[PDB]
Design an enzyme around this catalytic site. Structure first.
Site, short mmCIF file in Angstrom:
data_model
loop_
_atom_site.label_atom_id
_atom_site.label_comp_id
_atom_site.label_asym_id
_atom_site.label_seq_id
_atom_site.Cartn_x
_atom_site.Cartn_y
_atom_site.Cartn_z
N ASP D 179 0.83 -1.17 0.00
CA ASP D 179 0.00 0.00 0.00
C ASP D 179 0.88 1.23 0.00
O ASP D 179 0.73 2.11 -0.85
CB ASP D 179 -0.84 -0.05 1.27
CG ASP D 179 -1.88 1.00 1.31
OD1 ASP D 179 -2.75 1.00 0.41
OD2 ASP D 179 -1.86 1.82 2.25
N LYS D 206 2.61 -6.20 -3.44
CA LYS D 206 3.27 -7.11 -2.51
C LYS D 206 2.59 -7.11 -1.15
O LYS D 206 2.72 -6.17 -0.37
CB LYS D 206 4.74 -6.74 -2.34
CG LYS D 206 5.49 -7.56 -1.28
CD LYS D 206 6.70 -6.78 -0.77
CE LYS D 206 6.24 -5.68 0.17
NZ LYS D 206 5.85 -6.22 1.49
N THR D 207 1.85 -8.17 -0.86
CA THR D 207 1.23 -8.30 0.45
C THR D 207 1.10 -9.78 0.76
O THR D 207 0.30 -10.51 0.15
CB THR D 207 -0.15 -7.60 0.53
OG1 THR D 207 -0.89 -8.13 1.64
CG2 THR D 207 -0.94 -7.81 -0.72
N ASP D 209 -0.20 -11.07 2.98
CA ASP D 209 -1.48 -11.31 3.67
C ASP D 209 -2.66 -11.66 2.75
O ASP D 209 -3.70 -12.11 3.22
CB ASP D 209 -1.90 -10.09 4.50
CG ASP D 209 -1.07 -9.90 5.75
OD1 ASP D 209 -1.28 -8.88 6.45
OD2 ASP D 209 -0.22 -10.77 6.03
N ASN D 319 3.82 3.66 9.51
CA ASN D 319 2.93 2.57 9.85
C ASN D 319 2.82 2.43 11.36
O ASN D 319 3.82 2.58 12.07
CB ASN D 319 3.43 1.26 9.22
CG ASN D 319 3.56 1.36 7.70
OD1 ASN D 319 2.64 1.78 7.01
ND2 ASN D 319 4.72 0.96 7.18
N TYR D 356 9.80 -14.41 10.44
CA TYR D 356 10.82 -14.19 9.43
C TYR D 356 11.02 -15.42 8.56
O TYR D 356 11.24 -15.32 7.38
CB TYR D 356 12.12 -13.72 10.09
CG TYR D 356 11.96 -12.43 10.86
CD1 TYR D 356 11.31 -11.34 10.30
CD2 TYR D 356 12.45 -12.31 12.14
CE1 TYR D 356 11.16 -10.17 11.01
CE2 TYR D 356 12.31 -11.14 12.85
CZ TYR D 356 11.66 -10.07 12.28
OH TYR D 356 11.52 -8.91 12.98
N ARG D 359 8.45 -15.09 5.84
CA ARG D 359 8.63 -14.02 4.87
C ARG D 359 9.92 -14.12 4.05
O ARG D 359 9.97 -13.66 2.89
CB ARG D 359 8.57 -12.67 5.56
CG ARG D 359 7.51 -12.57 6.60
CD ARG D 359 7.46 -11.20 7.28
NE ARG D 359 7.14 -10.20 6.30
CZ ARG D 359 6.02 -9.50 6.18
NH1 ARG D 359 5.01 -9.58 7.04
NH2 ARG D 359 5.96 -8.65 5.16
N1 LIG Z 1 1.55 8.00 1.45
C1 LIG Z 1 2.83 7.89 0.99
N2 LIG Z 1 3.41 8.78 0.15
C2 LIG Z 1 4.68 8.65 -0.30
N3 LIG Z 1 5.48 7.63 0.05
C3 LIG Z 1 5.04 6.66 0.90
C4 LIG Z 1 3.65 6.74 1.42
N4 LIG Z 1 3.45 5.68 2.23
C5 LIG Z 1 4.61 4.98 2.23
N5 LIG Z 1 5.55 5.55 1.44
C6 LIG Z 1 6.91 5.02 1.24
O1 LIG Z 1 6.93 3.78 0.51
C7 LIG Z 1 7.91 2.90 1.05
C8 LIG Z 1 7.27 1.63 1.58
O2 LIG Z 1 6.09 1.98 2.31
P1 LIG Z 1 5.69 1.14 3.62
O3 LIG Z 1 6.97 0.99 4.39
O4 LIG Z 1 4.47 1.71 4.34
O5 LIG Z 1 5.40 -0.32 3.03
P2 LIG Z 1 4.18 -0.95 2.18
O6 LIG Z 1 4.54 -0.73 0.73
O7 LIG Z 1 2.77 -0.65 2.69
O8 LIG Z 1 4.56 -2.49 2.49
P3 LIG Z 1 4.20 -3.36 3.81
O9 LIG Z 1 2.84 -3.92 3.46
O10 LIG Z 1 5.29 -4.41 3.87
O11 LIG Z 1 4.22 -2.43 5.01
C9 LIG Z 1 8.57 3.67 2.18
O12 LIG Z 1 9.65 4.35 1.54
C10 LIG Z 1 7.54 4.69 2.58
O13 LIG Z 1 8.10 5.86 3.17
MG LIG Z 2 2.17 -0.16 4.99
#
Ligand SMILES: Nc1ncnc2c1ncn2[C@@H]1O[C@H](COP(=O)(O)OP(=O)(O)OP(=O)(O)O)[C@@H](O)[C@H]1O
Ligand SMILES: [Mg+2]
Ligand SMILES: Nc1ncnc2c1ncn2[C@@H]1O[C@H](COP(=O)(O)OP(=O)(O)OP(=O)(O)O)[C@@H](O)[C@H]1O
Ligand SMILES: Nc1ncnc2c1ncn2[C@@H]1O[C@H](COP(=O)(O)OP(=O)(O)OP(=O)(O)O)[C@@H](O)[C@H]1O
Ligand SMILES: Nc1ncnc2c1ncn2[C@@H]1O[C@H](COP(=O)(O)OP(=O)(O)OP(=O)(O)O)[C@@H](O)[C@H]1O
Ligand SMILES: [Mg+2]
Ligand SMILES: [Mg+2]
Ligand code: NA
Ligand code: NA
Ligand code: NA
Ligand code: NA
Lengths: 462, 461, 458, 458
Positions: D179, D206-207, D209, D319, D356, D359
């Site tokens: 996300d 990528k999730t 879950d 997060n 871990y 994952r």
């Molecule tokens: N709203 C946003 N705007 C810009 N960049 C973002 C935003 N949310 C997250 N990012 C950036 O995207 C990267 C990954 O985001 P995040 O760590 O939340 O993981 P994710 O893609 O949701 O994956 P996971 O499901 O493993 O947490 C990080 O560099 C984070 O700072």
């Molecule tokens: Mg996230």
């Protein structure tokens, strides 16, 4: 009552073995210090059984074997030594661990000038083949232990020793590590001899490769435990197939060319074999059919393990000069089909399924334990060759690593002892001829009748 | 657009399929309540729109499988039977186990009977071997391949089989197996009607090939793919270990190449992938091999068992026995490399037939879940009086499908689909100038190495 | 690669040949249905005309015997499993049962539930009878079907139970504690003049048993541990200045840690109890690792770093979780150096239960069955007060007193540990010239590469 | 009556979704021919009929992913970039590998660039570590867990990132992650537009879950279930080995319980399954445990990591950090069994956190195939100028979905669905008269044994 036995090799170089035979040849002199060890040979008794506590125990044998170890002084000048590796013969789990560990030990521990990998067995040492030699470095071998086979590749058939040594000279090789079996190590001696004729400063060191665990002066060769894991997984399949059919027979062939260690270990490990056929114990088609009959007196399923060197006397060469076997897996399966067909009466329905898991066993990656084993052998191999050992192989006996001269090792072979615990366990779990079919089953279902009643009570007592 | 395609079955019962054909037969009436739940929903056979709300490009609807409010059989008096027929395939025991437990735990049925060795266990003779399945019996069978009930080939007398069903009080027979099995189920079902017997005959489809129509996934298939890939790695190890080494591995596909294809792509290791959908000549194969051997010292050839049946010259059930194309192809390739000792100095062919290891091995965790779901829903629908049908999965949903429809069509690779397009990508190609293709290879390489060489110079100090 | 050491609670301070002699129930009048004098092996095969051992010690070889002490068709065998769980318990249980039932055709086999608790007056009500049908498939499962427990029971109660049930052989499967309990039980049975063998099948996933080169479960633990290490490695590689810390079983020794370190080829730091180092040294090794790499995998045995900070029902000293503590210290360290390490992550893996509660490798199974089989042979032949073990590829009998008096330990001068030193970060390397001689090794390689591939075009 | 359910995302961008929302943005124009293939098709969002041909109960169509006749970028001059962000998950390297090879083999793109450590690799500082991906580099990476590119947490400056994309000549950035990642992608895409840069930003979701909306399967998920099940068997082994033994194993589910649920059913071993969809109190859990311990000496409890967050009191990316419910639940259970030493004489709690290892482990064969397909199609569509979207899979078909839509809703367990109905079946139930339930158990047993006893007499 141990589970192995020695036996004369089909092509022995010595007819008797003496202490001098057991002494390992060493390139003259050891002037450089060992960077690893920033003083003399230790031995171990060939046989730890005593003659005559009292005053100290004396071996029932005069033979001592040289212990492999890193040495204070070494023969080759570390930063100028070039190491070569070749893999010959069939493939076997752990080749790449051997390759990788030799390289890294050379590069990390001794900081050798370069490591060369020769392609496709001895062919890579020929004038023609030599053009394909590659240089092995950390980056090349970093992850190869995850893969079966050999990155260097292997081959069958002889090459010209004069060409091969020509190649070793032209490339500046100081140590050739020959990874392979009996054939390979016999070739090693030839290469070593030709280099001597020339006065070339070259160690030829063997890392023994036999998935069969039939090497003499050895209780374990790399690949073997992995082969047993896989074989057992083959057996479960055959067992699944047999149980799914009324008068079902699962026949699975395992590796054993001259010996039945894999077949036997797998038979016991799986708890699922009903008949185990090994080369040590040649029996007739009639006996096999007979054991099968007995099995089918009290069960609707039968698993038959057969080693590939079994039943070679049941019917009528390769590039290297090895005698090709008749496929006993195929032949036995057919004879069993014949038998059950000719007895459609007694066995209304019936099925024979044959599994040949050969390549899946040999071409699969090593268990973690085999990896550790490969790395240790290879490491020690480099230590000893740096200290000028040559004309020998590294091996493992009595939980120790030893050096053994090719001539001795290629003169004898390890074989199942039918009086041993392993084979006694195969006799326990398998169908037996020497049991009154009747009273044997009578004393079965009664053991059963008991059990069920113990069961019935226990559950009422709820 | 699909990686699958439909095709008429070798022995079709319908020549066209209509909505009425798709309607699932139900034992008359449903008077008891469902202890589990203390009308029929449908799904479009085809979710692609034609031409406000989207309209299917097809008129067909398929009935969704589900637990029902009202059921036809009286739970605490119903007797369930299970038989497994045909070849074995990962998940039979999970099916057996789930049927039993769903019957016993959810519906609290009177008893579960397991019939031995396929339909043979329903014959007058065979019936003596029937066993009663209870929690204790099926608790751990999902850990094992094969079928505890056992299986068999060859027909039995439908009158004998129904005699057995009657004598034992069976209200539902679950028939686990393939095309043959389900055809047999219809016969059994028909004979039971002739007698006015209150009996559901419900099929749980068994095809390791994933070639069932009205289905995107059959149990065992994913497990087969895992295992096939493991076989492929071995073949690849063998090929890489030999100058001009060829690893030939035969996979399951009798009338279709889904396993062959999926395993080819999943492994990333196949150079040639031979499927029944795409019959080519010995000469073409040899030609592909030659092209492979122009730029590589290794070749892995996957061949489905139904390939190359036209390259040369029955079982107890009446199935046409195949010629072993694994063995034949291996020989032809040996012949070819021998007759060209010149071009290929050394060269080796190793053949792997991992067949029984694939079919007789326990299910992946995912297959197990799948088996249990199918079996559970199977019990739900049959309790609610569904009969003459199989349970299947399309578009992530479980549906009911009449045996007649299902046995009339079969799923097959679409050579214009993504899966097959991926096989074309990763494998040797005929239609490439051997020369310029390799020229544009080693150049891609020359580049790479120089990028490499710089990066590492830019390292020191 | 091993070394002996005095046990924390030794019963002997010195070991003599007589100490090594295995106690036998008086007399052996029945013939062995299986086989329708004692052989020995040198404790040490290194030599000082035929070679003479550098030691006077001989160990008795385990084997099936011509004459046996118990009347086969009337003997009742009992099995108990105590202490932690370890891969191969069910293979041991299954083989003891089948060897008794198939080979000796014993009267009955009894399984006692939840360790010694199942021998207590209360517990005994839960004893079950083991038969072929019960043990047929248990080798496919981890844990113990009999169950196990911690904490002592009254030896008088326990023997009461053995007597009431007609037990002639109790097989005690478990560790140091278990076998010490076995002696107690054996002693109380003597005080009563009871015809009872108490035979130990040694259980230690650590492979730290003395007079032994291999105990069941160990090789399986190593397979699993390596799988844990790969995960840690995956996690470290995926993160700039990533550290994967994985704790392994070694309570008083580091065999698993060490073997897994080498087998995986992936460990950068390997922490074992034989080699106690300070938080500062560890941090220092990490720094050196982070000089030439963006990743670090740290293996730590559970008995490491017990001196880094501040009992169970059986009286065992509870360890402080070094896995958790080390992870925290490493977090602290990387936090306090945000400068040098901009980003950085620590992931900790404790695969403990997955290692211990998982089914045996094929090789371990074979090993379990062999031990168990021989155990039955020797106890039928009246051996008691001892365990079965394996040295120098041979099975031997060893008196519980000897075995519980010494323990096996890593030898830091041995090949195994020398291999851990090779593959791991080293303190004693000029950080600078070490890396200088690295990237140069690299510069070479790439150029060899670059030529080979140019020599490829046309 | 399915097993999933949709739900508003914690940080939704749309509050309602319309057909126009579902339309995928495309870089203007498509002038080059597709070397691979030497108009858009759709699929109903919902294939259930309303009320001649069936009419969807919904107006929504989703665009089908496919290779296209005409493409937007000039193949032999396009530069592709790959970044992996967020946590790690099985299949990252298959994704990386397939994108590269599809680019290199199919489209014969100019070059492929891999950015290190997530978005950080696109920063001015990070960009210096970019590497060029070629066949040789990605050939074998599918055999490894983690990501060779590495990943990171925390934001970067979009202006820096686009600066990097421009300086390096990137035409397509593939963003692999969750996300957060895809939200970042939109920002990057937006900034590139402000500049009039010809750049596709395409997401590979990528999730681990499987909680992605408009999706029935995300890569990694089936592998997670395999591994989770293996964890469960371990916990089961541990529980069975102890009188009143409890195995507690925590599984991945942050906002949903698909892994927990699938693993619970797949293993046949879970007695209690705790998911976020079904928040219950410590008292209810303890109560289910009591019921379990009325008829069994063992209990396996699966708990999803997002469960029980309301049971007590941020990361670099913003997060919300979860409280470790695994640890807390384990403690509460220990407390409970301690405070009831009476009823449960002995009793043990063993906790497994296989996080871990799940994952950071390599993909199942089926996950690999899945990863390669998604990646392949990803390259096809981006070459044909798709941007601002992710590739996903619904109803056995591959679809394109705009980031805005996808990040606005999330998939969640339906407690009325078959999956969850199966969890209810196999687990302990509150709503059963403890007494008559067991009474109707042992009677089922009494029957069985007697059928047994007869059969064997016969
Ligand atoms: N709203 C946003 N705007 C810009 N960049 C973002 C935003 N949310 C997250 N990012 C950036 O995207 C990267 C990954 O985001 P995040 O760590 O939340 O993981 P994710 O893609 O949701 O994956 P996971 O499901 O493993 O947490 C990080 O560099 C984070 O700072
Ligand atoms: Mg996230
Ligand atoms: N007696 C010999 N003298 C010289 N070279 C030999 C001799 N025997 C074998 N070789 C060569 O050594 C190589 C390997 O021999 P071989 O094919 O017998 O394999 P091996 O090492 O015995 O292993 P395997 O047991 O798997 O066959 C081949 O090149 C072979 O021609
Ligand atoms: N048309 C039919 N009518 C009645 N019985 C049949 C028919 N076809 C097959 N059978 C019987 O059903 C059983 C299973 O048939 P078959 O051996 O073809 O298995 P299958 O279901 O096709 O599975 P597989 O794919 O493993 O072959 C056999 O005993 C067979 O004789
Ligand atoms: N000195 C002793 N005398 C009598 N009984 C003992 C003695 N030491 C331990 N025991 C008992 O033996 C049983 C097992 O001991 P313990 O829990 O220490 O297992 P262990 O054999 O040491 O295995 P692990 O290696 O897992 O600790 C316990 O019930 C314990 O109370
Ligand atoms: Mg030979
Ligand atoms: Mg203890
Ligand atoms: Na059978
Ligand atoms: Na092609
Ligand atoms: Na890293
Ligand atoms: Na070191």
């Amino acid at each position: 009552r141990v589970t192995s036995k020695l036996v004369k090799a089909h092509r022995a170089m010595l007819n008797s073995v003496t202490q001098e035979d057991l002494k390992v040849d060493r390139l003259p002199g050891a002037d450089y210090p060992n960077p690893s060890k920033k003083d003399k040979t230790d031995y171990i008794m060939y046989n730890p059984r005593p003659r005559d506590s009292s005053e100290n125990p004396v071996s029932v044998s005069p033979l001592l074997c040289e212990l492999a170890a890193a040495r204070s002084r070494i023969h080759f000048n570390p930063t100028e030594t070039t190491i070569g590796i070749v893999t010959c013969g069939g493939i076997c789990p752990g080749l790449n661990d051997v390759i990788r560990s030799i390289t890294l030990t050379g590069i990390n521990v001794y900081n050798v000038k370069r490591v060369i990998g020769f392609r496709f067995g001895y062919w890579g040492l020929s004038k023609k083949g030599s053009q394909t030699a590659i240089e092995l470095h950390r980056g090349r071998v970093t992850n190869i232990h995850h893969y079966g086979g050999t990155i260097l590749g292997s081959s069958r058939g002889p090459q010209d020793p004069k060409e091969m040594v020509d190649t070793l000279e032209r490339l500046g090789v100081n140590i050739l590590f020959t990874v392979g079996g009996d054939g390979t190590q016999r070739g090693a001696l030839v290469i070593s001899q030709e280099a001597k004729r020339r006065g070339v400063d070259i160690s030829v060191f063997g890392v023994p490769k036999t998935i069969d665990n039939d090497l003499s002066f050895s209780h374990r060769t790399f690949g073997f435990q992995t082969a047993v894991e896989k074989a057992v997984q083959a057996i479960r399949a055959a067992y699944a197939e047999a149980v799914s059919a009324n008068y079902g027979v699962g026949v699975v062939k395992l590796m054993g060319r001259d010996s039945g260690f894999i077949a036997a270990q797998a038979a016991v490990a799986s708890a699922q074999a009903n008949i185990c056929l090994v080369p040590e114990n040649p029996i007739s088609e009639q006996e096999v059919m007979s054991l099968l009959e007995r099995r089918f007196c009290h069960s609707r399923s039968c698993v038959i393990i057969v080693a590939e060197g079994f039943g070679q006397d049941w019917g009528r060469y390769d590039a290297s000069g090895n005698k090709k076997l008749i496929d006993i897996g195929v032949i036995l399966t057919e004879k069993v089909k014949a038998f059950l067909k000719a007895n459609k009466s007694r066995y209304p329905d019936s099925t024979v399924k044959y599994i040949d898991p050969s390549y899946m066993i040999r071409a699969c990656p090593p268990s973690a334990n085999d990896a550790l084993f490969c790395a240790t052998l290879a490491t020690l191999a480099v230590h000893e060759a740096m200290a000028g050992a040559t004309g020998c192989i590294i091996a493992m006996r009595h939980n120790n690593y030893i050096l053994v001269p090719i001539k001795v090792a290629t003169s004898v072979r390890r074989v199942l002892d039918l009086r041993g615990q392993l084979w006694r366990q195969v006799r326990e779990i398998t169908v037996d001829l020497g049991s009154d079919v009747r009273l044997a089953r009578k004393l079965e279902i009664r053991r059963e009748l008991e059990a069920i009643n113990r069961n019935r009570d226990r559950l009422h007592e709820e």
